[PDB]
Design a protein around this ligand. Structure first.
Ligand SMILES: [Mg+2]
Lengths: 279, 244, 183, 154, 93, 1080
């Protein structure tokens, strides 16, 4: 599937541009960065051109027109979240209306990290998938969401440590690995030693950069450092994953070489009983 | 698509093979080709041309007295042609639609064959307005039909785009699947292997789109919907349209 | 160009074949044309083996010299070549490969000309038109690699683009033209 | 700020976005073909059509932009030319008569019954603030002709 | 397309399963001599100018045709590993 | 054959020398045609006066320059890899401060190449080209500030590359800024260095610009005259002594830095014209009397406060505007590099005075060709400018002969900043063909010059224009500058005319680069012709007026890739330039003067001029083209024949009767076939391949040199260490292969020793035609060091169009050749005569290029009328006239059918029957007329031939002009299986007896990975490459009829394991349950 995702998306990539003239009173050339460039930034947690400041707080809305800098408050329970937006900025949310956490205050693009903290993980992910499609959709590209989803999945396959229990609180490990602990934390071994984890969003590149297997790291990243630190500890490289198992030249973990069918039986009645005749 | 989902793989092929043959076979006996006269120019030509001729003069007579601003005259005129051209368009199709339902050029476009409406215009009808080197489209439209001898300058103008078109196609095909590269660098170790995951965590797939023109929930386009539900695994069974 | 980043960037392969491409109307999607000259050289080894099963040549090298240089390639030789492939199928590859179908399996068959005959339906698949382009052709020597080559790489088996449930064997221009002028 | 429009002007503009949606959708379709059309690199058709997208993609923005923050005027009563009034200029010496209805910069269209002039237009500038009986001029390529506001109705 | 390819996919629990199965039996057909077939009587694969395709045509071409008939049986752990080439080489010349 | 041209416009002045771009440019550059008496200046001479007056006392100046004695003739240099130069001598004398001596001994310094009759150069055995280049004529220009819509910014740039980039930025916070070498400083300071005093300054300056207080500010420093300079230096980053080291300053005096360009135009232009007035000196110079005068700073600023204030005349110069963009012709480029060597030469003479041994030296002591010659050789062979002369055919070279590009020395245009210049600008009008640019990247960066358009005294491509008084057209014209053009109102040449006066009142014209409608009263000028609008490359298209600029661009370049077919045929339709082309192109040779024919030998042509004289002409039989092709000259005259001055003697490579003929005019029946003409596929009748219609001649130059290693020099001889005689037969001579021999892939042409014999590389070779060697006794050849001798082998063969052949039309419709159906079952016309080529209509719509559809029809009549036509670009034939003649043709096709005694055919019935039901024919009319009326549309009945059943519905037919391209099937035919291997790594690379399998790339693999073809993939990464074990292991199994080997461990696996072991890395291979695993 991996390759799939990659192909289905790669192919189109070589047909996306755009950025011309009809606008020009400030630093606006399109209203954001529509085209292939957007795809990058999306696949790579960045701060878009027309970032719309969101309100991590959920309340109402109040504005103050003209005079130096306009301001909009997201008051509610008691506190008032002030956001200073230049008079040359445009917003969609109007006075009064109720706003939720991680809501597009300004008109344009959103910010990855910001949306994450405010609303949460689930929101970001859904944002991404859709945000991508938008691009390919406005280009006559009809690709199933499946693929896009797989991608982003890895952009969150890693979280950070908050509460110790076996490793420092300054580390970021594989999301699944956390379950390897979450389970042995209370099930196998008693004494519940929680490990508050917080999923970390990473762009495609950075993601691979933090791969688990060393074999892979030995390719992309600086070989030296890799093997180096990988040596210190008796790092165990499970030969699972095209990339790494590719270097070795060994049969790829997928396809016909898959661990599921790699072992098949092709018996013929004429000899099937012959196995019974050996007992 | 239906065939495949019905009969089966192989069978589909045979269909395709059969089609291919017949397609060509008739495409030869049909007796269809392209001739200078096959690019019939709707008589409405001379009509609309005048309808838009004195029309423009009207807006001009206005600004000459200071009625419209320097910018208005620009957007105004543009509207004229942008739309006056849309007219001639549908016009031509009509003439073929009623008189020559078998006219070569025509049949092509309509049929799932080649040819595109927008393109046809630049033949029977005539190209609209081109763009200036900067970005803002030109002011003097292309009152000439491809089927007819396009004047010198108008050609010089129609080149502003030919050069531009070959410009973007040089900066997007150079990197050659650069994306895929980086993309694969993270999906190269993702493959199927299991027997039904235990995670009962469903996914919320929107059937309706948020705001487009005021906070009003609308139904997302047909395509998008499929691109998200077509072939999936319904977590919680749900009987809606009366079907289980 | 080190060692770790070596097995990745791949390299040159044997039994490689390529040339100008042309449409193959008569050809069935179940197969693909292929210049006799090429198939022959691109199959020197295999050929030789069958050359033995026949009184063509006494032993291996015997057949090697038999055609080491012959402007009169025995009529028997040819018939044998075809008798060599039989079911075995080769592979086709466009230069810019971005999608999986950038390479599909086909059952080659003796053909004239010096260019490779390719089916029109796959034209859409491997982004390429008949203006002068040129595809590639490999041959699954491994009787095991030959399996998955025609089992999961065969063209007639790859119609539904994984990218989208949209058909790939979508009739084009000419075909349509007729199918419409008739209905 | 706040774009000012009229019921009539609204119906024409709102409907405009509706027409453009039927067109724009046709643009995307054309591409879904060109991309599958084979022929690489120069579909004369491809690029020109691409820009065409930006053009509709753009008109879609300018349209939906104003439509989300506009107003509505019912200036059927009053004497001073306001937003929605239909004034009538009559060249003094000529004795010729005319009719017009100036409106906000988002209504410009010489086609309407009373030639709808932009609010920020020189013509729209010298009319606001004066009433029945006024006579003024501005700058004109052919010279400078003054006009007396015959009568302001509605 | 290929002969009853569909009927095949329906016999396997996974597309890739088929492949590995077709390949394994394909070899055993040539290495362990070409007389391990089960459909040799009639309807056996044939050639052209000379229907001599009754002895050695193409491996897989036969393998699948064998699966065409529910004569054979497959699985993950059907018969002991090593007990494979032992019962085969002794039963066939 | 008959010749009818529809020329309505009176083409006044004919097309100028299409090669004068390179011609005169070299001429005037190096005034050599006339003695030093005719003291010109510019170029060579000017170069002397420049860095010649040398004084360190060293006192040596220029006297006379002469030379031009080419060591070997043309051809000689080509075949002998020699350099077509010319011994360059120089006459100069020396005078001392101590009155005396006048030593003037002929001193020469290196040789210089020369320009060929065609306008090319023969550097080292090969013919190259010196392409022109564009840029921004080094002058004064004002353009708006970067991202600040505030004020604007002035700019001064006096080339050569040794000219400082000075800029004037108006810093709002206060004071004006002068950018130089990445540093800003108060211009005031400098002004003071010039003598400008506070009072005299401000007054005559900011008398209108209150902003003046932004420079009249200095009341502390601007109070010190000459002292200012001391300070100015303090600005220079370097920490040098504040003494009289006024170096950097003086640098910007009158020496090199400030452009030393012509005192009147080159510089004065951007001067007088834009700002200031007169040009004191040649640039912002004058460093005499200690002080400095610069009537440059005053203006540049006087213009600044001007635009930043009132309206002295709206001076906001435009970039792309050609009226400020200069060209760099061969002469300029060359003379430029020349000055380089001069400055480098003078470098020595100066130092060779400090160490000079008194007045006992002058010539050699101060001269050395080393510096000079070095430069020249660098430009003509190391500069990216010079290139491989594209001789794919006559036309091709011509285009590459007059093309232009932006990229170059760098100090003009870079590579990552020009999306602006790439687009066609308003000024390009009639100056640069908008459809002459190449495809792919760099598009726009490189594009030839227009037609009539010609270069001026200094770049600035002018263009012809018709003068007009009121409504009367003047027969006089002048080349207007891209600048002064906008000054007037020009009208089109389309404009109807009545003898010498305008027609309709509503006339079309272009005001200031803007399309406008003006009355016959404001007509200041008029277009000379539609031609001057585009370049030749395009002026060859039939009905351009009916094809998109995009698709036109295609056919335009396509003609350049045409192949010199043997049976040349002039296009059924011609733009009328074919005659001129073959002329200035020098593809064919014309008679110098009037006289009579003498010897008409297939190799030599002799004639006796009327002025009492006799001369013969070498007939280059079959010369090896630079792109591998034929270059013969077919004598189109006969023994004893009165000829006129400038008459067709022998045809060019692709010429025929003085008319260009790049291809053939074959019958065409556009219509969909059995899919054989799918995408762009092109069917074809064997009939054509029969009468050797589409075919050409190809050549292959394989060279071999007898190296001289220190392990025993290699000897050329029939000595073959493998006692092979079955291959030494054809190898008659002692090493070289016989002439006229039929070499085949693998045979030997030359025998090397140490056995490194030069065999016949993969593919083919053809039949040898001519070969020559070069022993030790070099009669006069520059045998490369370490080389004992050299040999060449000119082989060739015929290119008979087969299957993989591709051919396009002048309209840009390219397509391969699928099947070639025989004339037997080929769609035929009711009366015999089958078709020739079948094109698929589907390639007409999407591709808006109706032009073809036109040429066809027009050609459909030329077949029966038996004639050819010439249609001007836009003034070409019109729909009406055509139908007239075409109809006349019908009275010939069917007109004969009548008298012969036969009418219509039962088949012709059914077809016309559906014709009427298709609205093609007017019902009620008689068959006769029905067919006629239908013939006028360009469509006719047509029988299948395969089944005899005609195709219901007429099929537009005619004679379209096509042609084969350079790209053949020879350079593509890799068929490998078993062969060599990478001596270094382990890759199946061939080259000799076998070939090399194409690469696989990670891309293809991925897709392979997707499929899940684990084995198929693993097979490609090992058994077919690296791991040599499994490779052979596999070969055996195959030849043995056994299953292919299944690699247990790729050599890459185990090698890496230990490769890491080699350094710490305790790579331990564990099994499924943490257990050892034997690797080897
Ligand atoms: Mg192509």
């Amino acid at each position: 599937v991996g390759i799939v995702a990659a192909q289905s998306i790669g192919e189109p990539g070589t047909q996306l541009t755009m950025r011309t003239f009809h606008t020009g009173g400030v630093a606006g050339a399109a209203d954001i960065t529509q085209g292939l460039p957007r795809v990058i930034e999306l696949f790579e947690a960045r701060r878009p051109k027309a970032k719309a400041v969101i309100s991590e707080i959920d309340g109402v809305v109040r504005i103050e027109e003209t005079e130096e800098k306009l301001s909009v408050f997201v008051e509610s329970e008691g506190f008032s979240k002030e956001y200073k937006l230049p008079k040359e900025a445009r917003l969609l949310v109007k006075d009064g209306d109720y706003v939720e956490a991680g809501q597009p205050l300004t008109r344009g693009a959103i910010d990855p990290h910001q949306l994450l903290e405010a609303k949460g993980p689930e929101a970001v992910e859904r944002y991404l998938v859709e945000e991508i499609q938008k691009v390919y959709r406005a280009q006559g590209v009809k690709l199933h969401d499946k693929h896009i989803e797989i991608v982003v999945r890895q952009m969150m396959k890693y979280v950070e440590v908050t509460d110790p229990g076996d490793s420092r609180l300054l580390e970021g490990q594989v999301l699944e690995k956390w379950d390897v602990e979450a389970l042995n934390e209370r099930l196998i071994a008693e004494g519940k030693t929680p490990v508050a984890w917080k999923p970390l969003l990473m762009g495609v590149t950075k993601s691979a950069l933090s791969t688990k297997s060393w074999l892979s790291a030995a390719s992309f990243q600086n070989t030296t450092h890799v093997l180096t630190e990988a040596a210190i500890a008796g790092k165990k490289d499970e030969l699972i994953g095209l990339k790494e198992n590719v270097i070795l030249g060994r049969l790829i973990p997928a396809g016909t070489g898959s661990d599921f069918v790699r072992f098949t039986q092709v018996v013929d009645q004429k000899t099937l009983k012959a196995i019974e005749e050996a007992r | 698509y239906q065939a495949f989902l019905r009969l089966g793989m192989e069978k589909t092929a045979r269909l395709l093979d059969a089609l291919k043959y017949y397609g060509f076979t008739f495409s030869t006996t049909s007796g269809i080709t392209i001739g200078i006269d096959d690019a019939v120019i709707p008589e409405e030509k001379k009509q609309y041309l005048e309808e838009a001729d004195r029309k423009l003069l009207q807006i001009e007579q206005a600004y000459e007295m200071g009625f419209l601003t320097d910018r208005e005259r620009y957007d105004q005129i543009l509207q004229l042609w942008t739309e006056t051209t849309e007219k001639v368009t549908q016009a031509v199709f009509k003439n073929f639609e009623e008189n020559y339902p078998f006219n070569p050029l025509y049949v092509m476009a309509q049929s799932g064959a080649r040819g595109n409406p927008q393109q046809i215009r630049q033949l029977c009808g005539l190209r609209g307005l081109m763009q200036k080197p900067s970005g803002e489209t030109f002011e003097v439209p292309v009152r000439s039909s491809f089927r007819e001898g396009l004047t010198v300058l108008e050609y010089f103008i129609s080149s502003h785009g030919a050069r531009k078109g070959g410009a973007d196609t040089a900066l997007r095909t150079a990197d050659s699947g650069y994306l895929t590269r980086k993309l694969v660098d993270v999906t190269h170790e993702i493959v199927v292997r299991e027997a039904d995951c235990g995670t009962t965590n469903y996914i919320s797939v929107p059937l309706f789109q948020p705001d487009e023109v005021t906070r009003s929930l609308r139904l997302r386009k047909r395509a998008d919907i499929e691109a998200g539900l077509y072939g999936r695994v319904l977590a919680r069974e749900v009987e809606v349209l009366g079907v289980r | 160009q080190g060692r770790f980043r070596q097995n990745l960037l791949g390299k040159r392969v044997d039994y490689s074949g390529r040339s100008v491409i042309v449409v193959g109307p008569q050809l069935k999607l179940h197969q693909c044309g292929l210049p006799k000259r090429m198939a022959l050289e691109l199959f020197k080894p295999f050929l030789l083996k069958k050359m033995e099963e026949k009184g063509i040549a006494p032993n291996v090298k015997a057949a090697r010299r038999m055609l080491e240089r012959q402007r009169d390639i025995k009529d028997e030789v040819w018939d044998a070549l075809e008798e060599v492939i039989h079911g075995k199928v080769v592979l086709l590859n466009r230069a810019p490969t971005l999608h999986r179908l950038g390479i599909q399996a086909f059952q080659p068959v003796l053909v004239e000309g010096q260019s490779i005959q390719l089916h029109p339906l796959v034209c859409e698949a491997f982004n390429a038109d008949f203006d002068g382009d040129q595809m590639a052709v490999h041959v699954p020597l491994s009787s095991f690699a030959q399996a998955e080559a025609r089992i999961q790489m065969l063209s007639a088996h790859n119609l539904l683009s994984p990218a989208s449930g949209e058909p790939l064997a979508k009739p084009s221009r000419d075909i349509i033209l007729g199918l419409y002028y008739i209905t | 700020r706040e774009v000012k429009l009229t019921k009539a002007g609204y119906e024409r503009l709102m409907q405009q976005l509706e027409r453009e949606r039927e067109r724009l959708q046709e643009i995307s379709a054309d591409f879904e073909q060109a991309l599958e059309e084979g022929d690489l690199r120069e579909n004369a058709g491809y690029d020109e059509a691409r820009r065409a997208m930006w053009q509709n993609e753009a008109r879609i923005d300018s349209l939906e932009d104003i439509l989300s923050r506009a107003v509505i005027l019912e200036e059927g009563s009053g004497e001073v030319i306001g937003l929605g009034s239909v004034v009538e200029l009559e060249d003094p010496l000529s004795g010729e008569r005319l009719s017009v209805q100036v409106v906000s910069p988002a209504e410009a269209n010489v086609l309407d019954t009373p030639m709808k002039i932009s609010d920020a237009s020189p013509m729209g500038k010298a009319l606001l603030g004066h009433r029945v009986g006024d006579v003024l001029s501005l700058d004109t390529p052919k010279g400078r002709r003054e006009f007396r506001v015959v009568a302001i109705h509605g | 397309a290929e002969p009853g390819i569909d009927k095949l996919f329906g016999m396997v629990d996974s597309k890739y399963r088929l492949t590995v199965v077709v390949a394994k039996r394909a070899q055993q057909l040539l290495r362990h001599g070409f007389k391990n077939t089960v459909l040799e009587p009639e309807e056996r694969p044939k050639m052209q100018t000379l229907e001599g395709l009754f002895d050695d045509p193409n491996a897989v071409t036969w393998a699948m045709k064998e699966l065409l008939t529910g004569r054979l049986v497959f699985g993950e752990n059907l018969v002991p590993e090593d007990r494979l080439q032992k019962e085969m080489e002794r039963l066939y010349p | 054959m008959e010749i009818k041209r529809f020329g309505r416009i009176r083409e006044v002045i004919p097309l100028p020398p299409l090669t004068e771009i390179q011609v005169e440019s070299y001429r005037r550059a190096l005034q050599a045609d006339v003695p030093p008496e005719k003291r010109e200046n510019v170029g060579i001479q000017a170069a002397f006066r420049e860095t010649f007056p040398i004084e360190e006392g060293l006192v040596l100046d220029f006297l006379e320059y002469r030379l031009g004695e080419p060591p070997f003739p043309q051809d000689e240099c080509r075949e002998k890899d020699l350099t077509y130069q010319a011994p360059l001598y120089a006459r100069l004398q020396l005078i001392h401060k101590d009155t005396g001596l006048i030593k003037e001994d002929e001193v020469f310094l290196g040789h210089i190449p020369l320009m060929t009759e065609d306008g090319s150069f023969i550097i080292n055995g090969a013919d190259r080209v010196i392409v022109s280049q564009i840029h921004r004529s080094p002058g004064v220009y004002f353009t708006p500030d970067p991202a600040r819509p505030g004020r604007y910014i002035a700019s001064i740039i006096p080339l050569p590359k040794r000219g400082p980039w000075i800029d004037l930025e108006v810093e709002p916070n206060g004071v004006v800024s002068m950018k130089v070498n990445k540093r800003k400083f108060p211009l005031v300071l400098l002004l003071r260095v010039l003598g400008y005093d506070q009072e005299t300054l401000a007054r005559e300056l900011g008398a209108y610009g209150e902003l003046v207080q932004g420079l009249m500010d200095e009341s502390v420093f601007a109070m010190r005259p000459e002292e200012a300079l001391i300070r100015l230096f303090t600005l220079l980053r370097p920490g040098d002594p504040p003494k009289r080291d006024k170096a950097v300053a003086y640098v910007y005096g009158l020496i090199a830095d400030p452009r030393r360009y012509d005192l009147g135009e080159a510089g004065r232009y951007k001067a007088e014209e834009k700002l200031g007035i007169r040009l004191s000196g040649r640039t912002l110079a004058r460093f005499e009397d200690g002080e400095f005068k610069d009537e440059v700073f005053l203006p540049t600023l006087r213009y600044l406060f001007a635009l930043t204030a009132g309206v002295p005349g709206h001076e906001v110069d435009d970039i792309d505007h050609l009226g400020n963009r200069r060209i760099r012709t061969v002469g300029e480029l060359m003379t430029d590099q020349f000055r380089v060597g001069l400055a480098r030469l003078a470098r020595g003479v100066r130092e060779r005075m400090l160490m000079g041994s008194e007045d006992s030296l002058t010539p050699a002591k101060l001269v050395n060709s080393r510096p000079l010659e070095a430069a020249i050789r660098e430009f003509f062979s190391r500069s990216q400018l010079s290139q491989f002369k594209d001789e794919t055919n006559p036309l091709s070279s011509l285009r590459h002969k007059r093309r232009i590009s932006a990229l170059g020395p760098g100090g003009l245009t870079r590579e990552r900043a020009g999306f602006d210049v790439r687009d066609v600008h308003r000024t390009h009008y009639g100056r640069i063909c908008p459809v002459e640019t190449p495809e792919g990247a760099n598009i726009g960066l490189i594009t030839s010059l227009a037609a009539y358009a010609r270069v001026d005294e200094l770049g600035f491509i002018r263009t012809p224009y018709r003068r007009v008084v009121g409504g009367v057209v003047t027969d006089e014209v002048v080349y207007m500058t891209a600048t002064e053009e906008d000054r007037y109102t020009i009208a089109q040449a389309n404009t109807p005319l009545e003898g010498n006066r305008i027609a309709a009142e509503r006339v079309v014209a272009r005001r200031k680069g803007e399309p406008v409608i003006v009355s016959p009263e404001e007509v200041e000028f008029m277009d000379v012709s539609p031609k001057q609008v585009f370049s030749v490359n395009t002026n060859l298209i039939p009905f351009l007026e009916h094809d998109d600029a995009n698709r036109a661009l295609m056919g335009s370049n396509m003609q350049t890739q045409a192949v010199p077919l043997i049976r040349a045929q002039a296009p059924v339709v011609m733009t009328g330039l074919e005659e001129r082309v073959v002329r200035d192109s020098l593809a064919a040779l014309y008679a110098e003067e009037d006289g009579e024919v003498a010897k008409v030998d297939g190799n030599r042509i002799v004639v006796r001029y009327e002025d009492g004289r006799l001369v013969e002409y070498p007939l280059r039989r079959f010369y090896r083209s630079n792109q591998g092709t034929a270059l013969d000259q077919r004598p189109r005259v006969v023994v004893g024949q009165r000829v006129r001055k400038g008459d067709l003697l022998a045809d060019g490579p692709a010429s025929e009767n003085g008319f260009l003929a790049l291809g053939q005019n074959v019958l065409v029946a556009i219509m969909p076939f059995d899919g054989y003409n799918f995408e762009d596929a092109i069917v074809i009748s064997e009939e054509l391949l029969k009468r050797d219609f589409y075919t050409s001649i190809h050549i292959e130059r394989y060279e071999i040199e007898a190296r001289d290693t220190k392990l025993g020099p290699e000897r050329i001889t029939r000595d073959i260490p493998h006692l092979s005689e079955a291959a030494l037969r054809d190898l008659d001579e002692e090493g070289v292969v016989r002439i006229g021999a039929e070499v085949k892939p693998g045979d030997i042409l030359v025998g090397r020793t140490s056995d490194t014999s030069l065999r016949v590389p993969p593919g083919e070779g053809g039949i040898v035609v001519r070969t020559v060697r070069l022993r030790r006794g070099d009669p006069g050849v520059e045998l490369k060091p370490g080389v004992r001798e050299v040999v060449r082998v000119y082989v060739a063969q015929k290119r008979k169009l087969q299957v993989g052949d591709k051919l396009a039309n002048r309209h840009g419709n390219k397509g391969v050749v699928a099947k070639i159906l025989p004339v037997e079952d080929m769609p035929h016309l009711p009366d015999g005569t089958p078709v020739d080529v079948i094109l698929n209509p589907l390639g007409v719509p999407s591709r808006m290029n109706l032009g073809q559809i036109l040429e066809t029809h027009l050609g459909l009549a030329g077949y029966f009328l038996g004639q050819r036509y010439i249609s001007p670009i836009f003034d070409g034939a019109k729909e009406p006239e055509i139908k007239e003649l075409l109809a006349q043709a019908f009275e010939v096709y069917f007109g004969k059918r009548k008298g012969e005694g036969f009418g219509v055919d039962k088949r012709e019935v059914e077809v016309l029957r559906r014709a009427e039901k298709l609205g093609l024919v007017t019902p009620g009319k008689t068959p006769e007329e029905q067919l006629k009326e239908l013939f006028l549309q360009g469509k006719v009945v047509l029988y299948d031939g395969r089944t005899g059943e005609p195709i219901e519905g007429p099929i537009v037919v005619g004679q379209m002009f096509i042609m084969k391209l350079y790209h053949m099937v020879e350079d593509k035919m890799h068929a490998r299986s078993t062969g060599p291997y990478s001596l270094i790594t382990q890759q199946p690379l061939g080259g000799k007896a076998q070939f090399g399998g194409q690469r696989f790339g990670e891309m293809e693999v991925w897709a392979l990975e997707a499929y899940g073809a684990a084995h198929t993939l693993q097979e490609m990464l090992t058994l077919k490459s690296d791991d040599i074990e499994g490779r052979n292991a596999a070969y055996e199994a195959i030849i043995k009829g056994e299953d292919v080997p299944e690699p247990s461990v790729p050599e890459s696996f185990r090698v890496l394991v230990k490769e890491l072991q080699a350094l710490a890395l305790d790579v331990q291979t564990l099994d499924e349950k943490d257990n050892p695993v034997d690797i080897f």
